[PDB]
Ligand binder design. Structure first.
Ligand SMILES: O=P(O)(O)C(O)(Cc1cccc(-c2cccc(-c3ccccc3)c2)c1)P(=O)(O)O
Ligand SMILES: O=P(O)(O)C(O)(Cc1cccc(-c2cccc(-c3ccccc3)c2)c1)P(=O)(O)O
Ligand SMILES: O=P(O)(O)C(O)(Cc1cccc(-c2cccc(-c3ccccc3)c2)c1)P(=O)(O)O
Ligand SMILES: O=P(O)(O)C(O)(Cc1cccc(-c2cccc(-c3ccccc3)c2)c1)P(=O)(O)O
Ligand SMILES: O=P(O)(O)C(O)(Cc1cccc(-c2cccc(-c3ccccc3)c2)c1)P(=O)(O)O
Lengths: 227, 217
């Protein structure tokens, strides 16, 4: 399309701050945040973007017990189940990226079903990060290579970038062209690392609930002008 | 408190054009700006400064010339010099100059200055991977024992403080395959100022930005 942007990744941040300013509790920001997600996904689908990868940055996870962080992963991806039907009806291909290996088998089956169901859709490819880390991503790929070495099928010296690239999340999709981070912080926070080696980085102070189609348009135009 | 700053230096040629001068003129102004950045970092308690020359045999001799004429003063200033990158294919005289310069200064306790030469963040990670694959081949390591901490011990600069701030001059908003694994939690600061003009005030503005952002976030 005219903006020449095939794959956009977004670090969503600012929902709690947005609620706080309103005098509302965090759950109200979660709802406004969900609504801003739906709006970003329609925008991307309507603007010919091929893939949209979303990472929810939690400013609060440092105050929550580790036991709680695992459970929230439950509800989160669980919640994203009633939503699968809607994504499918909109011709979106859903993929979950992250470490879901420790997740209960019932949910892993659900994730696989969801991905299989929407795999042949021809609209936007939507990647949702769940228990995702950039370093972990690189490490799970390294492990896959470590198994081939242990099998006898790979010589350490044959490992190059191109080969490690085939084993990181989203390698079958267009490289990430643009990473947007809302909320004001200027860090990647262990979101994508290997995949953003050549991506344009766009930071905006706008809080996620307020980030709308015109903000997304501004980012794509900055990208178009910058490339 | 900012301990390790990484800078993507960019804008020398654009600067020269604006001045109506030739490329060599921007290179010269660029080198002076490198000296001023290093002095500044050393004078302000920064533990490590990592520099990457962004560009879209003669440079090899210049590299030798640069090491031969600057290493003594860096040594006197208690700077520890390290070159990061794939120098495996540089001519052996240059490889030897690099090795001696690093050896001469290895024990200094002031600023560690890392100069990227033929460096790439993906290559960096891949060299660490090869190291681990070797131990797997031998039999000293099981695939499933490989974790983040471990690969971290095999990527460049693992013995130094974590990179706190990455500064990129010149106007582009990309990492361009500079550090990747190492910038997971770093503050990213972009400025349109061209490298020859990047000065103490610009450097301080990035440091202040880092400090303020550390307070608010
Ligand atoms: O609602 P909160 O954030 O006030 C709290 O109950 C934690 C929590 C409870 C229920 C639901 C959620 C929730 C709802 C929607 C999204 C998310 C979320 C999405 C992505 C990353 C982190 C969190 C979490 C969080 P907390 O224990 O942190 O006070
Ligand atoms: O399908 P369209 O292009 O006709 C339209 O629904 C826009 C749209 C496109 C793709 C996805 C969505 C959409 C709608 C409802 C929910 C979601 C959704 C987004 C993220 C997670 C879960 C669900 C996405 C809407 P429109 O607003 O243009 O009529
Ligand atoms: O913005 P924060 O860091 O203040 C916070 O809302 C976490 C958060 C960040 C970004 C997005 C979301 C969020 C909230 C609700 C739904 C979703 C969502 C994500 C993906 C698909 C569909 C819905 C994401 C939550 P927190 O729970 O840590 O207060
Ligand atoms: O800024 P550019 O991309 O326009 C260009 O000057 C390349 C370049 C970028 C950044 C720094 C330098 C450069 C020039 C002179 C000296 C140094 C230098 C680097 C490290 C230690 C000492 C000196 C770096 C060159 P180019 O040769 O590609 O026109
Ligand atoms: O100064 P010049 O224009 O006479 C010439 O040496 C080019 C040149 C001189 C000095 C520095 C550089 C240069 C360009 C790009 C990168 C670097 C560099 C410097 C330090 C580390 C890594 C890379 C240096 C190029 P030339 O190739 O035109 O003979």
């Amino acid at each position: 399309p005219a903006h020449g942007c095939r794959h956009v990744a977004i670090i969503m941040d600012g929902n709690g701050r947005w609620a706080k300013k309103q005098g509302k509790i965090r759950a109200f920001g979660h709802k406004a945040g969900a609504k801003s997600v739906r709006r970003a996904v329609s925008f991307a689908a309507n603007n010919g973007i091929e893939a949209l990868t979303l990472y929810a940055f939690s400013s609060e996870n440092w105050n929550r017990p580790a036991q709680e962080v695992s459970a929230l992963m439950e509800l989160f991806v669980w919640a994203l189940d009633s939503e699968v039907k809607s994504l499918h009806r909109h011709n979106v291909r859903l993929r979950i990226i992250g470490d879901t290996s420790r997740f209960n088998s019932r949910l892993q089956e659900r994730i696989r079903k969801s991905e299989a169901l929407t795999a042949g859709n021809t609209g936007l490819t939507l990647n949702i990060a769940a228990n995702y880390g950039g370093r972990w991503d690189i490490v799970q790929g390294v492990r896959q290579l470590a198994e081939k070495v242990q099998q006898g099928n790979l010589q350490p010296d044959q490992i190059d970038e191109e080969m490690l690239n085939q084993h990181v999340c989203m390698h079958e999709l267009a490289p990430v062209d643009l990473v947007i981070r809302t909320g004001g912080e200027h860090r990647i926070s262990n979101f994508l690392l290997w995949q953003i080696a050549y991506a344009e980085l766009y930071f905006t102070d706008v809080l996620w609930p307020d980030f709308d189609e015109q903000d997304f348009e501004g980012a794509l135009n900055a990208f178009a002008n910058r490339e």
